[PDB]
Amino acid sequence: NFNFNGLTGTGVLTESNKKFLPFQQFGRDIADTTDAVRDPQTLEILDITPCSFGGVSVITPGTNTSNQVAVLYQDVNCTEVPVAIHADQLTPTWRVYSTGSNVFQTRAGCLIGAEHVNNSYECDIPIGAGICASYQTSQSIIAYTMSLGAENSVAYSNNSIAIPTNFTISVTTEILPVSMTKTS
Amino acid sequence: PLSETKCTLKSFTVEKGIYQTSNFRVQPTESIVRFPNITNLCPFGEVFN
Amino acid sequence: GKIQDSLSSTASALGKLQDVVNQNAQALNTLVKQLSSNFGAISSVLNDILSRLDPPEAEVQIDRLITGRLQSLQTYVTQQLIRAAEIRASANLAATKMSECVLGQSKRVDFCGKGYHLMSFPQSAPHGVVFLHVTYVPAQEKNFTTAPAICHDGKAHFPREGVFVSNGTHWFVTQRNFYEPQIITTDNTFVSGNCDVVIGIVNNTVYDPLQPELDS
Amino acid sequence: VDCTMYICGDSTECSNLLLQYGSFCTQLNRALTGIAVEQDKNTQEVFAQVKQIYKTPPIKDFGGFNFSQILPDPSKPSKRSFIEDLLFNKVTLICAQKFNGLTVLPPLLTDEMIAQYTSALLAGTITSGWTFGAGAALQIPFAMQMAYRFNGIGVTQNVLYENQKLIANQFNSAIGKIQDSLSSTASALGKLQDVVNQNAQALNTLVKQLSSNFGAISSVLNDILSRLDPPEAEVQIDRLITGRLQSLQTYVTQQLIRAAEIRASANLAATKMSECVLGQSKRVDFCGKGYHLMSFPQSAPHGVVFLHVTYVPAQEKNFTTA
Numbered sequence: 024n025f026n027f028n029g030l031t032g033t034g035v036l037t038e039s040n041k042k043f044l045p046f047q048q049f050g051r052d053i054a055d056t057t058d059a060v061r062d063p064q065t066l067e068i069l070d071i072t073p074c075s076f077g078g079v080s081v082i083t084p085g086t087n088t089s090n091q092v093a094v095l096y097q098d099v100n101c102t103e104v105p106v107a108i109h110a111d112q113l114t115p116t117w118r119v120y121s122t123g124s125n126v127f128q129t130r131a132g133c134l135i136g137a138e139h140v141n142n143s144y145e146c147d148i149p150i151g152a153g154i155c156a157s158y159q160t161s162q163s164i165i166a167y168t169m170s171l172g173a174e175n176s177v178a179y180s181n182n183s184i185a186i187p188t189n190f191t192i193s194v195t196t197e198i199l200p201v202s203m204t205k206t207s
Numbered sequence: 208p209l210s211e212t213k214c215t216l217k218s219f220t221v222e223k224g225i226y227q228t229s230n231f232r233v234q235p236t237e238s239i240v241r242f243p244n245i246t247n248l249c250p251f252g253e254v255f256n
Numbered sequence: 257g258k259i260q261d262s263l264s265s266t267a268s269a270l271g272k273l274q275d276v277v278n279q280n281a282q283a284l285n286t287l288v289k290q291l292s293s294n295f296g297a298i299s300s301v302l303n304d305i306l307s308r309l310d311p312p313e314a315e316v317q318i319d320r321l322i323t324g325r326l327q328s329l330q331t332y333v334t335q336q337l338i339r340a341a342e343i344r345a346s347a348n349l350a351a352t353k354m355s356e357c358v359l360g361q362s363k364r365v366d367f368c369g370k371g372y373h374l375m376s377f378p379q380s381a382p383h384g385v386v387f388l389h390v391t392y393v394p395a396q397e398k399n400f401t402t403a404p405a406i407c408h409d410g411k412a413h414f415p416r417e418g419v420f421v422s423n424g425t426h427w428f429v430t431q432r433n434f435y436e437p438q439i440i441t442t443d444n445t446f447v448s449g450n451c452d453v454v455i456g457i458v459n460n461t462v463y464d465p466l467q468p469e470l471d472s
Numbered sequence: 473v474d475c476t477m478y479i480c481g482d483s484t485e486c487s488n489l490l491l492q493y494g495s496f497c498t499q500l501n502r503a504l505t506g507i508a509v510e511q512d513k514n515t516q517e518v519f520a521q522v523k524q525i526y527k528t529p530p531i532k533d534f535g536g537f538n539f540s541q542i543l544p545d546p547s548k549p550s551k552r553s554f555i556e557d558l559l560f561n562k563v564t565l566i567c568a569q570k571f572n573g574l575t576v577l578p579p580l581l582t583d584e585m586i587a588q589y590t591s592a593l594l595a596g597t598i599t600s601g602w603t604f605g606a607g608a609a610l611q612i613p614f615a616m617q618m619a620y621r622f623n624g625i626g627v628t629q630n631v632l633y634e635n636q637k638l639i640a641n642q643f644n645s646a647i648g649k650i651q652d653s654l655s656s657t658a659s660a661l662g663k664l665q666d667v668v669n670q671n672a673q674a675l676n677t678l679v680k681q682l683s684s685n686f687g688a689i690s691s692v693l694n695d696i697l698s699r700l701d702p703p704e705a706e707v708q709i710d711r712l713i714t715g716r717l718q719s720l721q722t723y724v725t726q727q728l729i730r731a732a733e734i735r736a737s738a739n740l741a742a743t744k745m746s747e748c749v750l751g752q753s754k755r756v757d758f759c760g761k762g763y764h765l766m767s768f769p770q771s772a773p774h775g776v777v778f779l780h781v782t783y784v785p786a787q788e789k790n791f792t793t794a
């Protein structure tokens with residue numbers, strides 16, 4: 024919590040390369056929010072940013088199938104995750120999910136409890152940034168990059184065609200809402 | 208976290224998927240107050256004593 | 257039978273319609289919960305304010321409670337209006353699907369289900385409709401050699417309706433969506449100019465159906 | 473939007489005061505999550521219409537037709553076509569707004585995956601035509617595909633084979649002309665740029681609304697907490713909370729309306745892809761102006777571009793008829 028000549032705020036101070044004018048004291052962005060500050064005791068400029076901030080998401084398969092779950096912290100490098108939740112919860116359970124061997128970093132954020140693998144499968148539980156987690160393997164939660172599909176190189180040529188021999192009469196169910204309860 | 212998900216869903220069973228349970232923020236580690244350095248021997252102290 | 261079994265076994269098949277219902281239900285529940293909110297007032301029960309507090313301050317307390325409840329109700333009504341617009345769009349889509357699929361055959365791709373649409377069977381459901389889109393779909397495909405046209409009598413020939421396919425030795429004309437090879441004849445082909453302008457044209461004989469009759 | 477943080481900002485007293493208002497923040501968060509899921513579903517529906525990731529042949533022997541401008545370029549780091557690269561470059565604040573409780577960036581599908589989906593759709597349309605859009609993909613020469621489309625629009629296939637070279641040259645010239653028009657004209661992508669600008673303006677207005685006192689002594693909770701004692705700081709914070717909550721409700725309602733509009737646009741785009749891209753559409757002026765033949769999908773930041781190809785009469789001669 025920083026106070027600079029009444030400029031009360033909270034954030035992480037860091038060295039700034041901005042060249043403030045001699046008379047200039049505070050910095051601002053297009054949003055009209057402080058982004059830099061000058062130390063009143065020395066001609067130094069320091070940036071201001073939110074501490075870590077972020078939502079927490081639980082990725083879990085069907086409870087009747089398994090109990091272990093993965094924890095995703097949004098847009099935060101894993102190094103800050105142990106301090107992100109203060110690690111002051113009950114000694115088992117949450118403490119395990121705050122740090123461990125299976126820790127992965129992605130544009131979405133930091134994932135814990137999911138073992139990253141090179142193999143790509145269909146997106147089971149979407150996470151983001153083209154990354155999804157699946158419970159399939161002992162069975163454990165894994166995270167991977169969802170595969171858009173199976174590669175199929177069509178044998179194209181300028182003098183060859185493909186004609187069906189038999190067919191299939193498929194039936195597909197399409198469900199569409201038509202109305203809602205007439206609440207008054 | 209499973210119990211937090213159950214709370215947010217208000218149910219004892221949770222289906223496969225990802226659920227946003229809550230938010231988190233790194234609390235202020237310490238409080239820092241900085242004001243301009245103090246001028247040398249202002250007349251205020253001269254007046255007293 | 258397979259779709260019936262899938263619907264019976266799969267609980268999430270109707271997840272769409274149920275979700276809608278659930279959404280509405282949830283909203284209703286939320287509205288009721290909004291009646292148990294102080295909104296800065298001393299209490300959330302009008303009787304408590306009326307009894308404990310005298311009219312001079314009970315007036316402002318009830319005004320605050322009324323403002324909070326009215327804001328909650330307006331938010332709920334706006335959400336309901338947005339959801340009703342979404343439901344109207346869905347119902348218009350469903351009516352269009354009923355008209356173009358059940359009452360007729362639609363040439364739109366992936367509109368009346370996946371595949372070459374044939375017909376659809378409407379079914380009712382709580383606040384929703386289900387379409388059993390029936391679609392012809394190719395199952396097994398065989399690859400052959402094809403040419404854009406045929407030059408039999410020094411003139412290019414093009415299929416009247418179909419494509420010229422050919423296995424190892426012989427040449428045949430078959431419909432695009434089914435492998436039904438037929439003998440190439442002038443009946444199912446038409447000529448257009450010479451055969452030195454088309455690229456990829458091949459030599460072949462177009463049997464004349466009149467030749468057996470001409471001989472007699 | 474972190475409703476509690478945006479309204480209060482690590483103010484315990486403000487959080488306690490807002491707790492008396494019910495769960496408005498809960499509904500706002502639910503609506504925003506639903507909007508995000510809606511956007512993800514729209515993107516999936518528009519771009520996940522191909523069962524398999526079809527790949528073009530190593531040699532582009534398409535009877536003179538050129539698809540380099542629309543096909544992926546291996547040389548570039550990102551496997552994006554020239555037109556796709558131009559669209560991405562032309563479209564260009566948000567990253568400098570994630571300070572007051574905004575998390576925007578993470579999409580379900582990255583630009584690379586959307587580019588791969590578009591490439592697969594293009595490969596299926598070129599090598600297989602519309603066959604891959606209704607079952608197993610059946611290979612066919614592109615010249616024969618154009619012949620089939622000409623027959624479909626009511627023109628005998630013989631014209632294409634008689635003027636295959638001319639038609640291919642015209643198609644290449646049209647592709648080059650549209651590429652040049654997109655490069656030179658900055659208003660070609662007006663819709664996507666306008667949507668992005670509207671979203672950025674809405675977010676900026678929401679952020680700036682925190683500086684409005686809404687009838688309070690000050691717009692910063694610390695000043696009210698310090699200068700004013702709790703008996704009056706409570707009412708001041710309540711007034712500020714009411715103002716901020718009203719602003720957030722208005723912003724969320726506008727976001728919901730815009731999300732509904734975007735869902736309608738995405739449904740239209742998916743219909744066009746199903747009909748214009750995965751098949752031949754008989755609808756007039758639906759897949760471009762003129763007798764539609766085929767379409768080429770291209771990805772752009774938060775949008776799609778269809779290069780609708782249309783046969784159009786050019787020279788008309790008058791004759792007597794009975």
Ligand SMILES: *[C@@H]1O[C@H](CO)[C@@H](O[C@@H]2O[C@H](CO)[C@@H](O[C@@H]3O[C@H](CO)[C@@H](O)[C@H](O)[C@@H]3O)[C@H](O)[C@H]2NC(C)=O)[C@H](O)[C@H]1NC(C)=O
Nearest residue numbers: 187188189190191192193393394395396397398434435436
């Ligand atoms: C083209 O594809 C269709 C689609 O399946 C084929 O029809 C099916 O062909 C199989 C193989 O001959 C049939 O299985 C047979 O069933 C009988 C009676 O149960 C059984 O005694 C045989 O031992 C064999 O298992 C199947 O009944 C038949 N129909 C269906 C609905 O699957 C068709 O044969 C393929 N070929 C052609 C030229 O159409």
Ligand SMILES: *[C@@H]1O[C@H](CO)[C@@H](O[C@@H]2O[C@H](CO)[C@@H](O[C@@H]3O[C@H](CO)[C@@H](O)[C@H](O)[C@@H]3O)[C@H](O)[C@H]2NC(C)=O)[C@H](O)[C@H]1NC(C)=O
Nearest residue numbers: 403406407408409410411451452454455456457458459460
């Ligand atoms: C399809 O059939 C036609 C004839 O029915 C083929 O055209 C003929 O091709 C032969 C092969 O060369 C020609 O013979 C010789 O060609 C040389 C070079 O052009 C020329 O200098 C000779 O005087 C001699 O003509 C023949 O002239 C030509 N035309 C005929 C027979 O009327 C055609 O080649 C066949 N298509 C394909 C793809 O082979």
Ligand SMILES: *[C@@H]1O[C@H](CO)[C@@H](O[C@@H]2O[C@H](CO)[C@@H](O)[C@H](O)[C@H]2NC(C)=O)[C@H](O)[C@H]1NC(C)=O
Nearest residue numbers: 061062063064065066067242243244245246247
């Ligand atoms: C404000 O006053 C302080 C008083 O200490 C100054 O501190 C100086 O710091 C530098 C190092 O950067 C030392 O070399 C000097 O010896 C310090 N001065 C004294 C008197 O000890 C500080 O520089 C001043 N800042 C401004 C902007 O005037």
Ligand SMILES: *[C@@H]1O[C@H](CO)[C@@H](O[C@@H]2O[C@H](CO)[C@@H](O)[C@H](O)[C@H]2NC(C)=O)[C@H](O)[C@H]1NC(C)=O
Nearest residue numbers: 180181182183402403404454455456457533535
């Ligand atoms: C389709 O592609 C094949 C393979 O390249 C082409 O075959 C060539 O045809 C020309 C035409 O005179 C010959 O000069 C070449 O020697 C052929 N090359 C080979 C490797 O066979 C064919 O012309 C193309 N066009 C079609 C099939 O219509």
Ligand SMILES: *[C@@H]1O[C@H](CO)[C@@H](O)[C@H](O)[C@H]1NC(C)=O
Nearest residue numbers: 098099100101102103128129
């Ligand atoms: C912080 O996050 C960035 C990217 O999110 C990463 O490159 C960097 O290494 C992280 N630093 C720490 C100390 O976690």
